[PDB]
Scaffold this active site. Structure first.
Site, short mmCIF file in Angstrom:
data_model
loop_
_atom_site.label_atom_id
_atom_site.label_comp_id
_atom_site.label_asym_id
_atom_site.label_seq_id
_atom_site.Cartn_x
_atom_site.Cartn_y
_atom_site.Cartn_z
CD1 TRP B 190 -3.02 1.43 0.74
CD2 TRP B 190 -1.44 2.50 1.91
NE1 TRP B 190 -3.48 2.70 0.99
CE2 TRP B 190 -2.53 3.38 1.71
CE3 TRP B 190 -0.33 2.96 2.62
CZ2 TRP B 190 -2.54 4.68 2.20
CZ3 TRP B 190 -0.34 4.25 3.11
CH2 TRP B 190 -1.43 5.10 2.90
CD1 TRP B 468 -16.29 -1.79 -5.54
CD2 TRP B 468 -18.35 -1.48 -6.36
NE1 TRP B 468 -17.07 -2.85 -5.13
CE2 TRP B 468 -18.34 -2.68 -5.62
CE3 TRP B 468 -19.54 -1.08 -6.98
CZ2 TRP B 468 -19.47 -3.48 -5.48
CZ3 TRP B 468 -20.67 -1.88 -6.83
CH2 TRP B 468 -20.62 -3.07 -6.09
CG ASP B 469 -12.13 2.20 -1.56
OD1 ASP B 469 -11.32 1.32 -1.92
OD2 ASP B 469 -11.82 3.11 -0.77
CG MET B 470 -11.74 -3.76 -2.26
SD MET B 470 -10.88 -5.20 -1.61
CE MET B 470 -12.25 -6.15 -0.96
CG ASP B 539 -5.44 5.18 -1.00
OD1 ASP B 539 -6.19 5.71 -1.85
OD2 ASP B 539 -5.85 4.36 -0.15
#
Lengths: 718, 718, 143, 146
Positions: B190, B468-470, B539
């Protein structure tokens, strides 16, 4: 809550985290205490979920673990995996209790390193448990006092009321805090076993494994982590050796945060194990060695440990006989008279042992028949094994025999009577390798038959040497004596059967020196070394080819177990033509012997071979039991060099090799290692030189022509 | 008996050997006919067993295969594995028939590359069968006409009378005759996704995989084999891309004889699939691309295919809007008036879309609650979504909405009402990531609920954009609606449910541009691209960090799907402070947007942002749909460079970056690529230069001080 | 070093061919070999000495060495391959050619007619041979 | 007089210099190289042909250092030790592709093939008669051809 194991000049540290989580802390050079200087700032890592929802700084994905699982927030490769009756594979093991005692325990039905006295080592058992399913896992740690050795293994126990299915049960796991390392494994094939391959780690999975039902020529159950700047003579090295001769997995996984998970054990592929309530499962062990003196440092630790505390029997500490094997000499075309003809010539040379190879039993005139029918061929051997052995003995020589008890030929009396005694699965064609099948050693009736049958053969003649061969790998793995849910236990149960068979037979005949074999180094692993103190290194008997093979093999295994035979030329495997002098010097660097028709050599050739046998006997104790140093690698260049040094550094033997000649070549020099710099050593035929001079300045090598040359020097301190 | 597929200027060759054995022959540059110039001397290899005991020269261990198995004399990793009721895992697939037709078939319940007309490609289906168990496997091959694309997938069907359990079902396998290659995969985490890692192959197993129930930030479902001397601009490259958003295995195994087995598909770890008699199983596909024009050649092929023949919807070929997202701007601290304040400022800049991010629903003022309760927060948004959208619309701007339908917070009305709708296993603690749980999308009732709920939300306001996030990965994988024997199907069934959910919703709202997201590039894979034409890249919105991220991402995925936002400074993820000018040039190299509180910026910043929006609109069609060339890699040095070229080579855009300044630095130069050497190009603001000069001689790079600098050039043909 | 007469010829035929040894003290086996050698090089002296030369495998890098001579019209070629050290159970090899016509079928004397594209993109399978210092030599002719 | 020749058929450039003393005083040539060329960059490897008797012209491909690399002969001949040939090759260049710049000397005596990388990453390739143990006296009216 900190566990600190002290193995030689190394330290291994663990600590309990929160509620019974076992975390890895440190493995390396000995420190008096780990106070926490190198802490572990616990962080909330994205997408790494939390078992305790209140604390986002704790995740099993970011915890360095000793025996990790999958499904409880850890996403890295697990050391174990258990399937419940409900289909779920989620299990959470937490600390239950622990115990510490002097000595080292034996593993049930498995080979393992041992101690002769309790004071030799200390054992730590950490007990983990899963309350829901009643699963108990005991982690076994043992640290030797004299060596930098750490051994690890696991024992599963079902104390619950339901059946548990082990999908994966590895022997160990360890999480290094950094991944800045190279890794070494030993890939190979038949005729070229255990070549050294060093590579930098990649972010992902690197793995060496065997799906062949045996350790294998292709991948040896050994891997090592090495510091970036480490070499043969310096740097940190972390070795991992599996004491098991069946399927294995040796894997290193580097995660997103630069940690390296090293796990080793029975290959989870095509493997399951059913644990009914009250049943247990014991994994084989893994031997971990740390060294700051480089690859030689690590290797020398393994050598002493495996020679003195792994090998067993009366011949553990005994000098090994110089033998002659007739395989490359006669193959299947031989008779009683031919064998005794070779035995007499061997007697003139000083050879101490005559080994009768394949072809002595049943109708064995080829490799297509008669396996499983272990009775003397009266056509080839009129007077039987008894007569032949007795005839060899009166020449003052020992007699030896070749066997392959794990196999049965479809064309044999054994198979006609018991066609279902082999490994197979229902209604599928039975594949053959070398026209033979594998016996089902997972069955007790089969094992019982083999033990008694072979015992009869060994008791029929004054046999003091046995060569146990295996020339095929398992296919159609299955047993007719096992239920469907236990079918994937066949491969492992096979090995457990073999281990039992070997232990019983070797016990009945303690006066016999056993040498393990599997088309060469097919199963050259610590597991086999426990039952048979030496192994046939490779079917490739070429001098130049053996340079790589023996160099690579010496990385883990002691020279005493490394069989080497002088063969004919042109070589049967490669075609290469090398001088008898060079062929001798390479073979003398291992367990020395001969494999060629000695009845066919000239008196000039007989004289040199005669000198060889005489010379090796002088340096035998030095070679087989002395300290081994690798100097030049045949994997890195055109030269290969190594040397043997006595324990008191008062004696030495140096071997040098050069494969390819070039015209007008520059001069060469060789620096030695392991000598005492304060002592002077006389190099026989040259002069007396200082140890410091020999190691810091080096020795000038003589300018020499032609290809594949060798030279050898004996060193003795004044 | 030879199959020869022709995909563009590449060739893929197979041939039937003996009794229905499917063997791999050749994959590479197009050849008119393979007569056998590169033969295959069949040899008797030691320890490689024979299915036909009469012939020792035939073994599956030495045969190059298209879909290999284990246990029938092959010892390398199998493409599939099936367990029978008797416990045996031995299966023998042989040729039954084959079919050839124009076009490309749809995959059942799965995303896949498509055609708009049958003549675009040709499909070969090879049907294999195991007579004993009645198992049928159909191998699907498709070759595109205009591109060097080969797609591969498999279909299992149980025509027997017992149930068959699939332990492993990979999409493809291929055996290269040599292993002299490097390999490239995309490891990351990430905030740093898809870094390029090129490494030489080792003898053993190299693998990239995901056990997270999602594609992952850690490993992207892509691997490639590259020639030793291959680079960005030349050499042979073989790419493998998995069209699937769940667990995957991408593995390369090098065997004892130097062959390389590349296999890819659903991760066999924690995966089984039960096939009752009459049931079928369709695997996802893998897109295989060959290029002799280097890495860029491969990449450019993927770009056109995925943009035009994978992505769907009305926005497939349409230019994407410049948007502003309020996430980094306000996070959870915002209200209706605050949104309109940024929306008004966005109108002055020329921004076309305003996206309302997380925090608009339930009681969500933090990330610990309200997931699953999809109803407008009337405290934060008095006039609701309806009022807010219309308020944005009258400013001439589109309105967009953020959703995370796959997740449910323990603190929510949905969880109180349906605590069993999540993924879990019996009597085990439910672990949380970001204080949320994963909904059980393997259940039809759950999927039906989400479809209706989200449709209600989407139809309540003039919403033309959806993110559309997860923000979590699966743990405790299991379903209460599935029997124990189907428990390990949960992970895959979950993805099948999601795909269905997405397919239905996107169908109901063709006027909505959907952007997939998973904490950035958590699910940046061809599978999601089939449903949503663009993806949020990372991100991490730092300009310098994005250099590596976007460079690596462009290796497989088209720029049109690559989202990039200009963010605030100091950066929220790393801390770095870089000029607004450079943040733009990085962001303009992808799908351009803004993410920061624009109401709070200086007039100096407002002037540039106004100019940026104006500038990007001019080159938007060029950037998103033009040809992409990589010039300098930020993985190899202190600079990064790339350029966009129009299809007719009449227009170009060049971007250059230098991170670290040093004093008295040498002068730099940059050579261009993909231009027409026979045409002269005007570099806007400089002069007219020849294409040949720009590519062979190069452009002078500006001498500059300070850190993190950028420059951009527009090229127009005369 | 003791290398085969076949190898000593193949390497020498990759240049200005000639002999330098007492040819009066040779065996009839060696004499017969040399008779075939001279006639061979005579048939391709123009191709070797005045043709396009391509290097394929460098002896400074690996265990193998290879090169080839191609004519001007690319209608005739001559490939040479060399291997020095040997190992048991060795992996197989293939050599990919260069400087041919991709749209022209070639005939390798001894093997068969093959496509020019197949020889450059797929390669030529190298036969398994034991012993040290091994040499092979293919001759190519267009149809 | 700097001499340049460009072949139409091949990618060949030949270079040589011609000194001439058109003054009244004597001139002494301490160095007289045939050519020199300053490259704008120095991200190259370089290939020369070192060796000896019985092993002439082996291939050494090494990256450029930020100083001076030199292959020369002080034996009055081309020498087996160092063949009068150096080449600038690209980093990603092999036998089949890549930019290669060759430098071949047409002289069978003492030579000097030198590459110098300065503080600004520029490479100067020099080739000609070895300046070591070499001078040439130019009388007024005399000349010297390299």
């Amino acid at each position: 809550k900190q566990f600190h194991l002290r193995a030689g000049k190394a330290s291994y540290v663990m600590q309990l985290f929160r509620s019974g989580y076992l975390a890895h802390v440190y493995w390396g050079k000995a420190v008096r205490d780990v106070r926490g200087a190198r802490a572990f700032p616990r962080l909330d890592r994205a997408f790494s979920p939390n078992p305790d929802p209140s604390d986002r700084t704790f995740s099993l994905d970011t915890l360095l673990q000793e025996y990790p699982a999958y499904g409880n927030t850890d996403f890295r490769a697990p050391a174990y995996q258990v399937q419940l009756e409900n289909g779920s594979t989620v299990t959470d093991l937490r600390y239950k209790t622990h115990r510490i005692y002097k000595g080292k325990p034996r593993l049930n039905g498995l080979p393992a390193t041992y101690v002769e006295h309790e004071q030799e080592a200390e054992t730590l058992e950490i007990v983990l448990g899963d309350a829901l399913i009643g699963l108990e896992v005991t982690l076994q740690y043992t640290a030797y006092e004299k060596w930098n050795v750490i051994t690890r293994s696991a024992r599963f126990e079902n104390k619950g009321g339901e059946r548990l299915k082990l999908l994966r049960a590895l022997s160990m796991s360890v999480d290094f805090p950094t991944a800045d390392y190279d890794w070494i494994h030993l890939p190979g094939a038949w005729g070229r076993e255990r070549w050294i391959e060093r590579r930098p780690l990649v972010t992902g999975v690197q793995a060496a494994e065997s799906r062949r039902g045996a350790s294998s020529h292709q991948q040896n159950p050994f891997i090592a982590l090495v510091a970036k700047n480490a070499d043969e003579h310096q740097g940190e090295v972390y070795g991992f050796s599996f004491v098991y001769s069946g399927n294995f997995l040796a894997q290193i996984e580097v995660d997103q945060f630069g940690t390296a998970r090293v796990s080793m054990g029975i290959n989870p592929f095509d493997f399951t194990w059913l644990l009914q309530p009250g049943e247990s499962f014991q994994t084989p062990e893994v031997v971990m060695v740390y060294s700051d003196q480089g690859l030689n440092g690590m290797s020398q630790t393994y050598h002493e440990l495996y020679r003195t505390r792994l090998a067993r029997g009366a011949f553990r500490d005994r000098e090994r006989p110089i033998l002659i094997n007739n395989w490359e000499a006669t193959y299947f075309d031989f008779n009683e008279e031919k064998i005794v003809n070779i035995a007499r010539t061997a007697a003139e040379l000083g050879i101490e042992l005559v080994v009768l190879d394949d072809g002595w039993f049943g109708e064995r005139d080829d490799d297509r028949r008669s396996l499983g029918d272990w009775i003397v061929n009266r056509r080839k051997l009129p007077n039987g094994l008894d007569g032949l052995a007795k005839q060899v003995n009166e020449l003052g020589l020992q007699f030896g025999l070749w066997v392959e008890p794990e196999m049965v030929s479809p064309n044999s009396e054994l198979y006609r009577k018991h066609p279902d005694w082999c490994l197979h699965v229902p209604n599928r064609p039975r594949s053959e390798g070398r026209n033979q099948l594998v016996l089902d050693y997972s069955r007790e009736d089969v094992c019982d038959y083999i033990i008694e049958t072979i015992s009869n053969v060994l008791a029929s003649a004054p046999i003091t040497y046995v060569k146990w061969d295996m020339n095929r790998h398992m296919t159609e793995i299955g047993s007719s004596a096992l239920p469907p849910e236990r079918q994937r236990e066949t491969a492992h149960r096979y090995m457990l059967g073999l281990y039992r068979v070997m232990d019983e037979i070797t016990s009945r005949f303690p006066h016999i020196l056993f040498e393990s074999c599997s088309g060469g180094g097919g199963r050259f692993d610590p597991g086999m070394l426990y039952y048979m103190p030496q192994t046939w290194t490779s079917d490739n008997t070429d001098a130049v080819s053996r340079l790589k093979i023996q160099y690579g093999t010496s990385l883990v295994y002691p020279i005493s177990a490394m069989g080497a035979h002088v063969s004919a030329v042109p070589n049967h495997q490669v075609g290469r033509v090398a001088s008898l002098k060079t062929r001798g010097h390479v073979a003398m660097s291992g367990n020395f012997g001969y494999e060629l028709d000695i009845t066919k050599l000239t008196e000039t050739e007989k004289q040199m071979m005669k000198q060889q046998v005489a010379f090796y006997k002088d340096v035998r104790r030095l070679v087989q039991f002395g300290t081994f140093y690798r100097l030049l690698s045949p994997f890195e260049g055109n030269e290969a060099a190594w040397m043997f040094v006595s324990a008191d550094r008062s004696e030495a033997l140096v071997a040098y090799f050069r494969v390819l000649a070039e015209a007008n070549a520059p001069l060469s020099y060789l620096r030695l290692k392991g000598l005492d710099s304060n002592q002077d050593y006389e190099i026989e035929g040259l002069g007396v030189y200082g140890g410091d001079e020999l190691m810091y300045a080096g020795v000038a090598l003589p300018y020499r022509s032609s290809d594949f040359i060798s030279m050898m020097w004996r060193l003795k301190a004044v």
